[PDB]
Amino acid sequence: RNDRTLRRMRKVVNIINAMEPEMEKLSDEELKGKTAEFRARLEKGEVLENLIPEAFAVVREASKRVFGMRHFDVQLLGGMVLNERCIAEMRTGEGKTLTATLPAYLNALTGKGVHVVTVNDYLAQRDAENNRPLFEFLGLTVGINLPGMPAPAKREAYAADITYGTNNEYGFDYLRDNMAFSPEERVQRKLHYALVDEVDSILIDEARTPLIISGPAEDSQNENQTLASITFQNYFRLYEKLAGMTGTADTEAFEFSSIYKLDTVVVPTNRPMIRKDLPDLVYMTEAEKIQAIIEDIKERTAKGQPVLVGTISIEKSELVSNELTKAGIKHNVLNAKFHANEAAIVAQAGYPAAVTIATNMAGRGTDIVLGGSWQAEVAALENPTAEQIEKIKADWQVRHDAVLEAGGLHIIGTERHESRRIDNQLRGRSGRQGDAGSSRFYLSMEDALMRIFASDRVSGMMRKLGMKPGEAIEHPWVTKAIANAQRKVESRNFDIRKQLLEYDDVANDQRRAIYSQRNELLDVSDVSETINSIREDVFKATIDAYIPPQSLEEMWDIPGLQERLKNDFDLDLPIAEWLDKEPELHEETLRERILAQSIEVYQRKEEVVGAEMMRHFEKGVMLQTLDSLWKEHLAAMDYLRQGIHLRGYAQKDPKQEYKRESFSMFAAMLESLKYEVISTLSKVQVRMPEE
Amino acid sequence: RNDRTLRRMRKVVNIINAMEPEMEKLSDEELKGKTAEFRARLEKGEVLENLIPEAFAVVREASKRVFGMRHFDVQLLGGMVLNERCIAEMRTGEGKTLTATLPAYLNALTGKGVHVVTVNDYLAQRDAENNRPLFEFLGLTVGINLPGMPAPAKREAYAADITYGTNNEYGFDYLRDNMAFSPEERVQRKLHYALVDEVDSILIDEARTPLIISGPAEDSVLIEELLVKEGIMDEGESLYSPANIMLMHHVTAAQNENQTLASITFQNYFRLYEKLAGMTGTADTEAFEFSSIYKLDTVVVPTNRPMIRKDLPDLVYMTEAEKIQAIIEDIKERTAKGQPVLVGTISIEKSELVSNELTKAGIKHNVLNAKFHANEAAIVAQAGYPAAVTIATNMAGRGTDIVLGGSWQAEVAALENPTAEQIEKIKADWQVRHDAVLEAGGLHIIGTERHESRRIDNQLRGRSGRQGDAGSSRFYLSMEDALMRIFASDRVSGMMRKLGMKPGEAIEHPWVTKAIANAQRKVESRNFDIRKQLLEYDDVANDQRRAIYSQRNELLDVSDVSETINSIREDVFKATIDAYIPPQSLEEMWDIPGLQERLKNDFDLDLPIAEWLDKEPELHEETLRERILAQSIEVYQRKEEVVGAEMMRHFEKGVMLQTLDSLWKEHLAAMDYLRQGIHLRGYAQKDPKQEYKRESFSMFAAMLESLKYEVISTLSKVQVRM
Numbered sequence A: 001r002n003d004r005t006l007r008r009m010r011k012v013v014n015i016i017n018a019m020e021p022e023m024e025k026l027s028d029e030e031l032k033g034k035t036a037e038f039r040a041r042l043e044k045g046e047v048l049e050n051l052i053p054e055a056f057a058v059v060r061e062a063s064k065r066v067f068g069m070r071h072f073d074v075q076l077l078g079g080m081v082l083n084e085r086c087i088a089e090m091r092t093g094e095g096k097t098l099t100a101t102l103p104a105y106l107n108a109l110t111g112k113g114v115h116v117v118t119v120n121d122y123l124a125q126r127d128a129e130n131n132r133p134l135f136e137f138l139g140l141t142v143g144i145n146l147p148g149m150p151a152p153a154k155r156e157a158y159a160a161d162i163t164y165g166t167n168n169e170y171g172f173d174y175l176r177d178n179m180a181f182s183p184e185e186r187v188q189r190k191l192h193y194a195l196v197d198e199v200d201s202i203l204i205d206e207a208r209t210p211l212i213i214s215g216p217a218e219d220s221q222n223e224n225q226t227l228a229s230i231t232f233q234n235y236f237r238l239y240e241k242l243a244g245m246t247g248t249a250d251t252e253a254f255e256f257s258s259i260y261k262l263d264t265v266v267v268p269t270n271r272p273m274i275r276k277d278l279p280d281l282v283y284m285t286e287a288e289k290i291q292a293i294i295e296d297i298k299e300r301t302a303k304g305q306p307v308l309v310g311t312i313s314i315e316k317s318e319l320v321s322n323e324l325t326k327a328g329i330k331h332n333v334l335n336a337k338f339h340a341n342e343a344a345i346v347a348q349a350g351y352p353a354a355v356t357i358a359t360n361m362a363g364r365g366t367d368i369v370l371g372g373s374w375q376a377e378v379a380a381l382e383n384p385t386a387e388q389i390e391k392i393k394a395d396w397q398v399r400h401d402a403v404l405e406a407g408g409l410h411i412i413g414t415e416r417h418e419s420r421r422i423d424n425q426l427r428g429r430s431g432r433q434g435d436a437g438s439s440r441f442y443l444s445m446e447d448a449l450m451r452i453f454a455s456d457r458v459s460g461m462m463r464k465l466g467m468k469p470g471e472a473i474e475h476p477w478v479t480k481a482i483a484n485a486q487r488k489v490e491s492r493n494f495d496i497r498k499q500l501l502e503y504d505d506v507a508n509d510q511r512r513a514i515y516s517q518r519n520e521l522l523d524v525s526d527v528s529e530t531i532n533s534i535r536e537d538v539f540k541a542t543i544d545a546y547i548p549p550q551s552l553e554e555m556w557d558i559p560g561l562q563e564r565l566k567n568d569f570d571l572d573l574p575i576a577e578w579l580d581k582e583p584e585l586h587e588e589t590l591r592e593r594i595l596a597q598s599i600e601v602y603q604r605k606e607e608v609v610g611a612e613m614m615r616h617f618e619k620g621v622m623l624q625t626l627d628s629l630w631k632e633h634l635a636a637m638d639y640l641r642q643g644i645h646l647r648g649y650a651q652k653d654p655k656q657e658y659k660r661e662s663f664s665m666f667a668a669m670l671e672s673l674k675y676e677v678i679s680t681l682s683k684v685q686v687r688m689p690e691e
Numbered sequence B: 001r002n003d004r005t006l007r008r009m010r011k012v013v014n015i016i017n018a019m020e021p022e023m024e025k026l027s028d029e030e031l032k033g034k035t036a037e038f039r040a041r042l043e044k045g046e047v048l049e050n051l052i053p054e055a056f057a058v059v060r061e062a063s064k065r066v067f068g069m070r071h072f073d074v075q076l077l078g079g080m081v082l083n084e085r086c087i088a089e090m091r092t093g094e095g096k097t098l099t100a101t102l103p104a105y106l107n108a109l110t111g112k113g114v115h116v117v118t119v120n121d122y123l124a125q126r127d128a129e130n131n132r133p134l135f136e137f138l139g140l141t142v143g144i145n146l147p148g149m150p151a152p153a154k155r156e157a158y159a160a161d162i163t164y165g166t167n168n169e170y171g172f173d174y175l176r177d178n179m180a181f182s183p184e185e186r187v188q189r190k191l192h193y194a195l196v197d198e199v200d201s202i203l204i205d206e207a208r209t210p211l212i213i214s215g216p217a218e219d220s221v222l223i224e225e226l227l228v229k230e231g232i233m234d235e236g237e238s239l240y241s242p243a244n245i246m247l248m249h250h251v252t253a254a255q256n257e258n259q260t261l262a263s264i265t266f267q268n269y270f271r272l273y274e275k276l277a278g279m280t281g282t283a284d285t286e287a288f289e290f291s292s293i294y295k296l297d298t299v300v301v302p303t304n305r306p307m308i309r310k311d312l313p314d315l316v317y318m319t320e321a322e323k324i325q326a327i328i329e330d331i332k333e334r335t336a337k338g339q340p341v342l343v344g345t346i347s348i349e350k351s352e353l354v355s356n357e358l359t360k361a362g363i364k365h366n367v368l369n370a371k372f373h374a375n376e377a378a379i380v381a382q383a384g385y386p387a388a389v390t391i392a393t394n395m396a397g398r399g400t401d402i403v404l405g406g407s408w409q410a411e412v413a414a415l416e417n418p419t420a421e422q423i424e425k426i427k428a429d430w431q432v433r434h435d436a437v438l439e440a441g442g443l444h445i446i447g448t449e450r451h452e453s454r455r456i457d458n459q460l461r462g463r464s465g466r467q468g469d470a471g472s473s474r475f476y477l478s479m480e481d482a483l484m485r486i487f488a489s490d491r492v493s494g495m496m497r498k499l500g501m502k503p504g505e506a507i508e509h510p511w512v513t514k515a516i517a518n519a520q521r522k523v524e525s526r527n528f529d530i531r532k533q534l535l536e537y538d539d540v541a542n543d544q545r546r547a548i549y550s551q552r553n554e555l556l557d558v559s560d561v562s563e564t565i566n567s568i569r570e571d572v573f574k575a576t577i578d579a580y581i582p583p584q585s586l587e588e589m590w591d592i593p594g595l596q597e598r599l600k601n602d603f604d605l606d607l608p609i610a611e612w613l614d615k616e617p618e619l620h621e622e623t624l625r626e627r628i629l630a631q632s633i634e635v636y637q638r639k640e641e642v643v644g645a646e647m648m649r650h651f652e653k654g655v656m657l658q659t660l661d662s663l664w665k666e667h668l669a670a671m672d673y674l675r676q677g678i679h680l681r682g683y684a685q686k687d688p689k690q691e692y693k694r695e696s697f698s699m700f701a702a703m704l705e706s707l708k709y710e711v712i713s714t715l716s717k718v719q720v721r722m
């Protein structure tokens, strides 16, 4: 499950490890050739996963030679996880970027492409350029997809062995491809593998975010409207293979599984994680909390230990700062108005006895180097030189080791966030890459968070334990109590969310159906058989409206049928004439004459234009009618859902009823798609010369 | 004007430079003793400005030895500007922070203190700590003032030769110094010299920002029936006199609550200093406002190396789409010659448009995305790299130097074990890039739109052409830009929509550039006119606060306040008796059923005085007044024999200060209510400004007389068990 699959993966790592000597002997150009060899074997029927050891050994030697970086064993494990339908949890500083080169290479081999998905355009370009030398070294091409990029350049990016771009541009390209009128206009290939770089934002926070293409199609002054829509969740769901990465930034494993059927695997850190996460401390009042924070700081800084303090607001950043100053403790506040000051502060935040106050600390942040960053120190130098550097490093080693000795970076959370993943991000700022460190969070009985115990009498019991000034005790049940509360908030929030996804699933299955139909049309030149086929459906249904099947003549509405055929099929037949003249004519033979006549008329239009022109007109009419009924259906499904509140209630589930109305409305649209296609083809004015 | 100042100052620079060998020959200890020598000369009557050449030369040699930096000739000039009541406009890259050591030193010599004013606490602390070794080398002490610092520590910081702190904290300390009950509680000295490190924000943007101390430190048709009745209001006295404003605010209204205890704006704080100066980059445009608000002259200091950035004619297009296309073509032409470009925009949405368009054109670039700060700093690093293109959205002022060719810093700043070979390689390869960027024209700046504030446009353009580097800038405009509403004519603007700009056919008109600059200047000036009216309202409050605090500080500074008390008690007793006995009046026209209970009620003074006058028909009105004063003195001296002189003198003083503070706080509240009650009372016609200044000064005058009365009433009625 975790260490069952991990102990199985460790066996493979040993084999990759056992292969390095073999790989070290290989020439650069022999490493290049392995890719072609792997593909030959796949062509002969080999199973991809059988290639992982050799493939991963190849990638690791290529990196060594190219980046001067050798994947660690835990990065091998990470890369195996990402080949499966999984989230690899890898802690910050663990080299997720380099790890991702592994499953990208592996899943590039079948020739079906890879989509590495980034949170923004800077990272897509940056990661494509950084990795392009590695992948070219192994005979693979690298694409980059950006907004604004012309279609032929996008096709090229999707045609590469491995592609980089944001979630957004991938999703938009998919939508635009399902508005194409010829398959050649498509930019994407089949959606094979999506490797998602930060799944918390991309897959969880953005799951239900619609991606929309809008337009003034406004067939009938004229408005904007949705022409094509998909949510992120339902986009990523289209891929054959989906995987992603995040930091020990978890608490949401159950959600990945619900939303995506993604398992999450906790990947072990390269070095033992030794940060001491100390029990949560609870105080009656904010003031006694702050005095406690100040006394911890005072104590640790006197020992040489740097501290980073996270708060939830500027106001609270100010308060602890003023109180530190009142206590004589030098520090810096990270002030979001002064970015240059911020980078300068951050740089020396791991310096002996440094104290930094940060307001709503981000995810990941700049690494805090213990003892200071000495690279900032030469960065400063205007003519850096040898003896000069060496003195700096050597003075730094001493500081670094003194900071480690003193316990590494201490993190203080002055409050907890309602989301523990945020708390976890702050805390993860310390103890990176094996470094000594610690963390402590402070709560008061005032703290907003003491409100997710949805009871003022419950919470205020903790008062009767006392919290008594200096005479703190520590109670670790509190830490788990608080963690559990945070768990229940997420879980409550997700139940709500999961109901909203069950509504989303109605639109998803409708979209999937209409698009797969649209794509079957798009993929062929000749839509004849379908046309012929729906023509009989349309005439049957149209005739049934005036001639109830197997009715006597007296129930028939021939006047009404005649006009209908005139009005909608430009088909003006003397049906009354027929009946009143042939006492042979039964209902079935009337149905045929009518059908036959439509056909004869259409065949002469074809004779004028030519077959090819006609085949492509049919196809375009189908796609175009499909598109405009879908647009109309999207708008109507939107009105339907937003009116979900007072429709299903007296023992019926709303939904059950929405699913009913939705089914009925989708069913009707497909009938109406056949109607409108045959109506258009029937009515197309062609100007006819003689014979 | 600027030409003559700089001429005379270039003369002094030549003297300074001639002194360098004298200073070079001095031991470090001899250099330090220059300070004491300057001060022995000042004690003997030397004029401070006679010292500038030697003192500057001393600071310049000190900086060489401590910092390994020798002030440039232009930094000497900036330093001389800053010793006068002037703004030294010194371009981004020019070493403002080092420049400021010079006037700080010199203005520290008289032993009266220097306040260096920074924008934030980081910079205060950093500057203080960076300059401490420099000023200690020269025999001076440096202080740092921060929020939360205990008063003893604040005292120490202000008692240092030079102090660093934010504007905010300086002003707050001033307010709290004026809430002190003894002079030894004060943390500041007399406000001598304020050197303001970036005056655009500190002096202009924030001129009118109130600093406020609040404190729980309170104590406790339709008009007609409201008006009628009760213990306060009942004569038939208007509920909406200025007088009765707190009352009316009460009916407006129908725990304990916090009020303003003290307030001052930055602009009025800084005007308290004996000397004021400050710095900013070539931004100007606001010289007229500095001069008008602060009486600061603005001297534009030349750059150390010639400033050769080529600031090209503004270009105007009919449509935004036409503008964007022109911006893309130029970026295309320049990047093909290897020249890097910085594109500044006014919106995220504008960035995304230009960016997507550059991608449609196959032009590699990076947007600076506000969400991704670590990306943004990596971007800025390579922004001066050949053919680099960077899009920034409402870029700030100054910002991080873009090094041409790239920073040969950031490259080794990512290299964890260099050598001679390596860096040497890095640096050599960087020189070729650098030299090629220079030769391609340096950094080209594109303003895709102009801001309403030309100062902002000038900041953006100033990122190019630093420290003598080649560079250029060009601003783009279209008829669809919000900036065409800075001209107040729809139709005047539309004659560009008659000289209608066409496809492969650019011209250029210098009058357009001039016309836009002039429109932005007419906008600045219109905004400042609006602001000046507001500063007039502020001047009413400043006048009253300056007067009240000057009174308060006189009291605080005197150990013994008896003579002030005795003097005001006669004042008070004379007027009070005037209210019932008209001067030189015959006994006939005297009211005592009003006078007797007045004295009893307001002063615990019960002198059955009709029965003097029944018993003695021989005293007369003046010897009557004499006796009435005499008695209160009697009762008073008696309370004091019980209490102690000392104890009494300090009680009287505290009572005067507490009364003044109560009356003052009440006045601040009533004025705040008048000022907003001065939005709709009866037309902006019958001048609302003017009437408010009158009622306000009227209430101020009233409060001054009421401060006398209340003190004497407090001192008359005070209980001591005999």
Ligand SMILES: Nc1ncnc2c1ncn2[C@@H]1O[C@H](COP(=O)(O)OP(=O)(O)NP(=O)(O)O)[C@@H](O)[C@H]1O
Pocket: A068, A069, A070, A071, A072, A075, A090, A091, A092, A093, A094, A095, A096, A097, A098, A364
């Ligand atoms: N196997 C390795 N050998 C040498 N250096 C490495 C190795 N793996 C990673 N690095 C470096 O270690 C740092 C961590 O990179 P990164 O993947 O950005 O860390 P992360 O926190 O897990 N990921 P992210 O924040 O998404 O970029 C980078 O500076 C890498 O270049």
Ligand SMILES: Nc1ncnc2c1ncn2[C@@H]1O[C@H](COP(=O)(O)OP(=O)(O)NP(=O)(O)O)[C@@H](O)[C@H]1O
Pocket: B068, B069, B070, B071, B072, B075, B091, B092, B093, B094, B095, B096, B097, B098, B197, B198, B279, B280, B281, B398
């Ligand atoms: N005379 C000098 N000799 C050598 N280096 C100097 C000298 N003057 C300044 N520098 C350096 O030039 C840089 C400029 O930064 P700084 O003085 O803060 O801002 P500026 O734009 O230069 N003016 P301002 O930003 O308001 O101070 C700093 O690295 C200084 O250390």
